[PDB]
A and B are shown apart, each in its own frame.
Chain A
Amino acid sequence: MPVAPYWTSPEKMEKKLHAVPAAKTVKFKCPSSGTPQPTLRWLKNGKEFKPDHRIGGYKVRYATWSIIMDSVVPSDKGNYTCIVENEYGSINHTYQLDVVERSPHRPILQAGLPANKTVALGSNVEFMCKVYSDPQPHIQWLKHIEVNGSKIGPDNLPYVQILKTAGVNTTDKEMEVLHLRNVSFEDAGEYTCLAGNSIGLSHHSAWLTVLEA
């Protein structure tokens, strides 16, 4: 009869880390038994786990030795320790709750970049294009060039050439500036900053005018 508290089904306790997005339900169960009925306590990073700490409350199911959350918030991240004890003997286990706060969106480009510039011939030009995206964006610098006489191909699209495209060994912050040293009259035209993640696309263009000294 004098039995120490033990873990009945340890297979339900292998999931150590619980990482769910915002507004999600998490279930922490610590199955145990013993004679007589043991108590089940919860510790939030070594403190009191009172329902008045988090907004919305929770639901502890004593029939399954579990606790159910409701719309987790980043304030609920940390470690949760369940304690089981009845007579002489106190077993415990610590879980880890993480709330991954992320929201996908199309790549946002800073308004005004790139900007139209004119520093005549022989000077140095550098266009910029501030890009930000959660699923990591791809950057390409295009130049609207002209082939043969005109500059519009089939259907109704302009001819462009690849100036700078990100690849494998490519810094995410080096594709933000397009350098043009010396420059010439051939470089006069339109420069586009094509950026896109896995949702949509976004691009800003700017004309370059080359004068004379």
Chain B
Amino acid sequence: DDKAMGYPNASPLLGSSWGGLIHLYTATARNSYHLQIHKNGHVDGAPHQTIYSALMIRSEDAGFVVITGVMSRRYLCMDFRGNIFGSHYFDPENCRFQHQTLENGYDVYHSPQYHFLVSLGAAKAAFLPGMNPPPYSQFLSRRNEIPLIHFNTPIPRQHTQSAEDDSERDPLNVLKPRARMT
């Protein structure tokens, strides 16, 4: 019999296994930070890999990529002033950037509708064919080293279940009603 095994393939790669998330590294000689997106849509620098800095890179058009914060459920969007933030809703006119690798091996992302380079700093400059890049604009995709167990936020807050009272007749909670009837 001929049988059908398969075709050549080399299985997954950079991440934990198929955790294809990467952290965007940035270095400006003096300092060094990672691109982080908080739960409220604030972008700042994280010196080490955090859960809010985990980004998923997924290309869309012919050469354009999509940067999504996998923990905050927010997309990286740029406005007309050049700022960047996080929005829970996708928009191909603002939350879409073009990627290109320079000669020094660093990746640069800029908006096709605003020409502003995605920069961690306040230097929201345009792009030039190999002139002077603004600071905090040259990124480097670094593999993820965080286990996927820490990527789900907890929930048992429950502030003041019964306060202190200093007279609790049932401290070990032996009496537990179940909320019945209506």
A/B contact in complex, CB under 8 angstroms: yes
Q: Which of A102, A112, A201 contacts B105 (CB 8 A)?
A: A102
On whether A198 and B58 interact (CB within 8 A), knowing A15-B32, A17-B32, A110-B7, the answer reads: no
Contact with B along A97-127 (1 / 0, CB 8 A): 0101010100000101100000000000000
Among A35-43, A78-86, A131-139, the stretch that binds chain B is A131-139
A128 located at the interface, meaning its Cβ lies under 8 Å from any Cβ of chain B in the complex: yes
A166 CB–B CB distance under 8 Å:
yes
Name the prevailing secondary structure of the A interface residues: loop
* B114-150 interface code vs A (CB 8 A; 1 in, 0 out): 0000000000000000000000000011100000000
Interface pair A98/B59, CB less than 8 Å apart: no
Q: Which of B41-84 contact A (CB under 8 A)?
A: 47-48, 57-66, 68
- Chain A residues within 8 Å of B104, by CB: 21
Q: Are B7 and A128 in contact (CB under 8 A)?
A: yes
Q: Which residues of A contact B68 (CB under 8 A)?
A: 168
A138–B63 CA distance with the chains assembled, in angstroms: 8
- Asked if A201 and B65 sit within 8 Å, CB to CB, the answer is no
A135 to B99, Cβ gap below 8 A?
yes
How far apart are the CA atoms of A136 and B20 in the complex, in Å?
10
Q: Report the count of interface residues on A (CB-CB < 8 A).
A: 36
- Interface assignment of A196: CB less than 8 Å from any CB of chain B: yes
Chain B residues whose C-beta falls within 8 Å of the C-beta of A172 in the assembled complex: 20, 58
B141 touches A112 (CB 8 A): no
Q: Given A12-B30, A113-B7, are A100 and B58 also a contact pair (CB < 8 Å)?
A: no
Q: Does B101 sit within 8 A of A, measured CB to CB? A: yes
Tell me how far the C-beta of B83 lies from the nearest C-beta in chain A, rounded to whole angstroms: 22
Which of chain B's residues have a CB closer than 8 A to the CB of A198?
59, 63-65, 98-101
A130 to B6, CA, bound (A): 12
- Residues from chain B with a CB closer than 8 A to the CB of A104 are 101
CB neighbours (8 Å) of A102 from chain B are: 105, 141
Q: Residue A100 contacts which of B31, B48, B99, B142 (CB distance < 8 angstroms)?
A: B142
In the complex, are the beta carbons of A100 and B25 less than 8 A apart? yes
Most buried by B among A98, A102, A132, A196: A102
Mark B residues whose CB is within 8 Å of A. 7-10, 20, 25, 27, 29-32, 47-48, 57-66, 68, 90, 98-101, 104-107, 140-142
Which residues on A are within 8 Å of B, measured CB to CB?
A: 11-12, 14-22, 24, 98, 100, 102, 104, 110, 112-113, 128, 130, 132, 135-138, 166-168, 170, 172, 196-199, 201
23 contacts across the A-B interface (CB closer than 8 A): A14-B32, A15-B29, A16-B47, A16-B48, A17-B25, A17-B48, A18-B32, A19-B32, A19-B140, A20-B27, A21-B105, A100-B141, A104-B101, A130-B8, A132-B10, A135-B101, A136-B58, A137-B59, A172-B20, A196-B63, A198-B63, A198-B64, A198-B101
